[PDB]
Design a protein around this nucleic acid. Sequence first.
RNA 1: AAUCGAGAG
DNA 2: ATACGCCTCTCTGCTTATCGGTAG
DNA 3: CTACCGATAAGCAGATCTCTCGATTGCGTAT
Lengths: 115, 90, 48, 107, 254, 64, 57, 101, 62, 18, 178
Amino acid sequence: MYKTEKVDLALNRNRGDPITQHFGFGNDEWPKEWLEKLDEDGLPYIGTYVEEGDPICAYFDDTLNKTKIKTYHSSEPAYIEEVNLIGDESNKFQELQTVSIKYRIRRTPQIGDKF
Amino acid sequence: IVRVPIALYVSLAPMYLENPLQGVMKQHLNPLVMKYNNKVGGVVLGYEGLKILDADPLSKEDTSEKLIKITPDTPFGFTWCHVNLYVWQP
Amino acid sequence: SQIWEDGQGNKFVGGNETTTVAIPFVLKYLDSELSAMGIRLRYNVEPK
Amino acid sequence: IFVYQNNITPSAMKLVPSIPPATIETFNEAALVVNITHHELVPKHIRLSSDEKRELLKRYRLKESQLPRIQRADPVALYLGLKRGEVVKIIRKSETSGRYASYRICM
Amino acid sequence: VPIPGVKQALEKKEGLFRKHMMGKRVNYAARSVISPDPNIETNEIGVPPVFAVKLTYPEPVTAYNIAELRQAVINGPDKWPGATQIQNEDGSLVSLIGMSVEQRKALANQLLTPSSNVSTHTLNKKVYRHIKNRDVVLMNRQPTLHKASMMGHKVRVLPNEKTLRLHYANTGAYNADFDGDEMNMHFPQNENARAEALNLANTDSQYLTPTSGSPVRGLIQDHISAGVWLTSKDSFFTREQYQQYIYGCIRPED
Amino acid sequence: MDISKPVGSEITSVDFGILTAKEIRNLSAKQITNPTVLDNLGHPVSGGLYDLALGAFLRNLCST
Amino acid sequence: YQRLRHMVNDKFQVRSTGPVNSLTMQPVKGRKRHGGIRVGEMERDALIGHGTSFLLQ
Amino acid sequence: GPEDFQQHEQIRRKTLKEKAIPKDQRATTPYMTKYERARILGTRALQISMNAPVFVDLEGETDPLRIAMKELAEKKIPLVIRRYLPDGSFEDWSVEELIVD
Amino acid sequence: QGMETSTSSFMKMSYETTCQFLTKAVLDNEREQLDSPSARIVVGKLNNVGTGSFDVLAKVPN
Amino acid sequence: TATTLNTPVVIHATQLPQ
Amino acid sequence: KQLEGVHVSYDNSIRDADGTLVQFMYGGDAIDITKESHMTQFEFCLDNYYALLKKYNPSALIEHLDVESALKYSKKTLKYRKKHSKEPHYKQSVKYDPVLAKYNPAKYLGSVSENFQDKLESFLDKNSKGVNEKKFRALMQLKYMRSLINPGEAVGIIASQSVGEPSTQMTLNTFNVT
RNA sequence: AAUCGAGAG
DNA sequence: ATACGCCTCTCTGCTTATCGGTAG
DNA sequence: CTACCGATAAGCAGATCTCTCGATTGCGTAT
Ligand SMILES: [Mg+2]
């Protein structure tokens, strides 16, 4: 099974207000155990295995002077099929505020599955 | 320095169903000594002649095997009691 | 010694004749919704 | 007991409870050619005296009003002249248990 | 569209009576798909191990308990049978989820100790043990159109799957097939409800429906045709076949 | 429900009545005056609908 | 043979304790939010008809 | 003060003894009903679980409900079934005086 | 309409037309004794039917 | 503390100070 | 909703939760349906007499009962009913009522239904068959005493279910009167 | 949280 | 840009209008 | 004769098992 979630970091900021968050890691006090499932650019490596409580994408918001992440919220474990980078309709050379992630879950036939 | 009779509604634990008098004593009457009680007037130095009511009124007072009402949700039993308390009136 | 205070410090005397029963919380919420209708419920405690 | 042929005026019905301690009952000659007790669906109704009524009430620990009630105006109470408060005995021929007795009250 | 008022908060099925007092969401329940099992004893339910680690029962420790409640506390929250939580004498709730084996061993060493605090000298610690085989469960299949559609089953803890396992005789009572039906399972937490589900609501007592007194349990199809074959005049069995059939279906160790 | 927490009192019966406007103010903890639920700074106002009188709101101790 | 999409990993749920509703202090709705299941009107009626009263409570 | 409470207590006791049906004329079923059996077992199990004394010898058992069934077998459960009547009167039958099944 | 005459108002309020059965209850100041099963649930008391039909008392032998 | 297992549900005096 | 309170009381009369009486006897015989199946199956009861006797155990169920008055009154009532009953129901008179009215059937052996006793008599008359007929009648009467609905049985809930749940099996309306 | 759609028994 | 003001196909009962019968 | 009633005709209020997913939730004026 493939499931795709859209991590749109621009949900708060809108209509020319300052960029509140940036994809990546800041210089704050952050646990080093986050680089296992996250690349240096605050996006997960393709082919990693994510469970509940596993970081998905890391961003640094200058507002809080802290590193915040969005976590995988799903009981069924998944792998990461791909990580897209989507740009906006604004031709101004802005940062990426949209990252698309497609997961891959193994649906091995268990019992209780209908044939 | 006076003696005050009291009507009490106490809970009897299941562990004391062989000496209910001692059980009521230890659960409630002992923790009521040398402490200012908001009802009787003040402190209590002691007590004597503890008596337990009965849940079956037909049983005359010339008995030792009294019934205790049991809480529906809980093994603990509830019943009324009588006891003379020796207070130190302010 | 039958007085007590509030968080605002406005102390006053009141009846300490209060008990502890076992009830659902939805009963308490229904009693609130009934206060919003100007309707009071009087729950009689069996031991007085 | 007064029976009348066709109709009753209001000027007659206004005196039914007017003469205590006696009682007057009214019936129509029409809608009487058939006894409602001979119909097989109607059980044997036996008016109960007070002597056994108190006995029933003490046996079951009942108030008067906690019994099944029979209407003061239903034809069975009309047939029996049943007053308010005096219970009645009913022999219901049950399909399963054969015969059994139940007690309604007129109220 | 209109803003709801106080009356609309109580009026209909979506209100408050018929939705939060006439029926409530409950704790210590589980839902899953049922799959058949003819190797459970018609009074039991096959509990998947995934439920058997979550659902727990409060068990107060005693002298007849510290043999196995101690072992459950040593086993911990994952290995079954084990325990998740320990409730202390003064109401403190201790969780075993994060602890280490040394901590669990020390706690189970102190699982029955005399109380120096005399306020709670009448209480004993409670261990939230896992649902073992001696426990009882309350199955349920909506629409619960009669009392037989909510019975009591003993628990048989199976090792493999994640579907509740049901015997075939529990089909005329639930009006259930095994083509994706899901049944609710409720785990009572007090001895009174335990004794209720074991004696009053248990499945052994529901043999005849009160509707007309006709029986409601029995084998269904495969067992019926197998019986017609086994009990015909053409069926003959040697000594080994006879003894094997009899032992396999009897098993005097149970 | 814990079976080691016995309850002594029970609700033996209930009755329906009217909450007179005198007793409401007798039993009240605060009168609400101004429709200021949350002002600027993202906090409730004093004496508003979400007052600290009517309970402890967010990380604020109840004023009652 | 065709494999249908109604796998059993999307069906089972178990709850012992957890999040509760706002004003009723009762379990939340929903498999994915860690909520309890509902004992409805018909379940209540069937639980009374057994004479099971401690169980119903 | 205490005169008011004494009056209340006396009236409550009077009603109580007016409701206690004497042993001479209690006319309920001699056998113990299934509901009574279930609740007696459950409450006895609760009491054993909460450390109440046991009047039978366990065969090394550890299920309190099984222990209660043992005591009910040996007729050693000190409980009384207050069979309330619809009017509010009641009879006190002891479990010993009641025959199971 | 068939249950207008009933001692317990909680049963009717939980049944339907809660408002009409609550105003009718509060006008008559109708105190209900908590006998119907529904009222027992609403208050949260052990039911009367079945194993609620009786009470259990101990026999303390001292 | 001061629960049903230490303090009585209700205390009443039956007679004035003897 | 309305039958949820109706239940069988210790007086064997079924009645609403507040106290109001609905019936004096559950069905007129106070027997349980989950126990009524083989009462009329006299052939089965006769053939299994010894096992049924060992399960009922009159040895431990005869000190607490009265086994004279109910039988005497039942005999008198049956004699009177035999004398009459060629007459219409409106013409008969209750000199003697049904036995179940007087004696509590859970306490008086022989106080049984008016149709159960008649059918048992017809059986014991139309076939004589080595266990004496007296012991078989005593066993049937103890079986009736044990086939009684327990006080507290939610007859209201059970009846509501028994009328509703089978009604889902008829809501197809294929083929004037409703 | 309301609706809309899709479905499972 | 941004804060104020706002929008075509059911089925039981209980309860009321309306322009005339109905005993004294 | 006169209230006084009343058999129509007419208006009005409420119901019509459990479960899992996703997608979307509004618009005119005036500083
Ligand atoms: Mg199916």
